[PDB]
Design a protein around this nucleic acid. Structure first.
Ligand SMILES: [Zn+2]
Length: 271
DNA sequence: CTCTTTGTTTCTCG
DNA sequence: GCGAGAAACAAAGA
């Protein structure tokens, strides 16, 4: 998932598990806990969930006063709230059990990660990752964004995917954003003019905020605790190879850019 | 049978 | 430093 989908999951967990005492924690795949599973089990059993935050595509569980569990879902990670008697599913890896149910993490590809760190280590953790600003008008400063684009010869799509110019875009929303802002994904960033940078800046904020309002995009695998998003119905290019651009009627094309499948209108997004 | 594709991140190689 | 390619892993389609 990308930022919109992670935020939707964050909001649903906030509503449902805040205030819950963790009775026990179990793993069938303890190796995805990067800080040590038996260590996490010992520290968190008997603690109460106080909050759930997010930074970029990362979930942050706030547990007791001084623990933060940082969870990344990578490509296929999924959480569900289940009854205590729910049967195991094939790709279930970890569970936190409460009095009235359990929070299960599943990940077919085993890419997702958990890391237990202290409250005062959360800010340093994300500085070390080099995560850029959240995609909001208040945090995403167009002036610094412009200056960074000016000095680079990186192609715009790969650069945006790095999470360093702005946090939260992945393959779906980077494609949607570039189509909205009429920029070709292979455009070298130092070639972008000020007015194009301004439309790109605003289009990143607008599309992600729309995706969040609509509960994310459900394409193949995504749902927020069993709830389908509605953003998939608004996609203009991603997965739309061979269909006609809603603006000009040209056929959406798909190419490969830096290892990634890339969907664009060849008329609206001039090379 | 092989080869390609997939909502992420982070490594090696030259 | 960089870009290209690939690994971590599983499943599905051609
Ligand atoms: Zn078009």
């Amino acid at each position: 998932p990308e930022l919109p989908e992670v935020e939707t999951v964050r909001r649903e967990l906030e509503k449902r598990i805040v205030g819950q005492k963790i009775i026990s924690i179990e793993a069938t795949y303890p190796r995805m806990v990067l800080t040590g599973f038996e260590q996490l089990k010992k520290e968190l059993t008997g603690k109460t969930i106080q909050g759930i935050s997010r930074r970029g595509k990362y979930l942050i569980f706030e547990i007791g006063d001084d623990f933060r569990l940082i969870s990344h879902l990578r490509m296929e990670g999924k959480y569900r709230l289940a009854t205590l008697d729910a049967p195991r599913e094939k790709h279930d890896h970890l569970t936190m059990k409460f009095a009235d149910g359990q929070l299960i993490y599943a990940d077919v590809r085993k890419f997702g990660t958990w890391e237990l760190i202290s409250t005062d280590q959360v800010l340093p953790y994300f500085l070390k990752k080099k995560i850029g600003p959240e995609p909001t008008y208040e945090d995403f400063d167009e002036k610094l964004f412009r200056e960074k684009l000016r000095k680079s010869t990186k192609k715009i799509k790969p650069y945006l995917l790095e999470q360093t110019l702005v946090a939260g875009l992945g393959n779906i929303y980077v494609d949607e954003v570039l189509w909205l802002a009429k920029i070709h994904p292979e455009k070298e960033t130092n070639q972008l003019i000020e007015s194009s940078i301004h439309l790109l800046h605003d289009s990143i904020i607008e599309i992600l905020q729309k995706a969040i309002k609509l509960g994310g995009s459900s394409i193949r695998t995504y749902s927020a605790l069993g709830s389908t998003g509605k953003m998939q119905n608004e996609l203009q290019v991603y997965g739309k190879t061979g269909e006609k651009c809603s603006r000009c009627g040209a056929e959406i094309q798909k190419i490969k850019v830096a290892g990634r499948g890339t969907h664009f209108c060849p008329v609206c997004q001039q090379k």
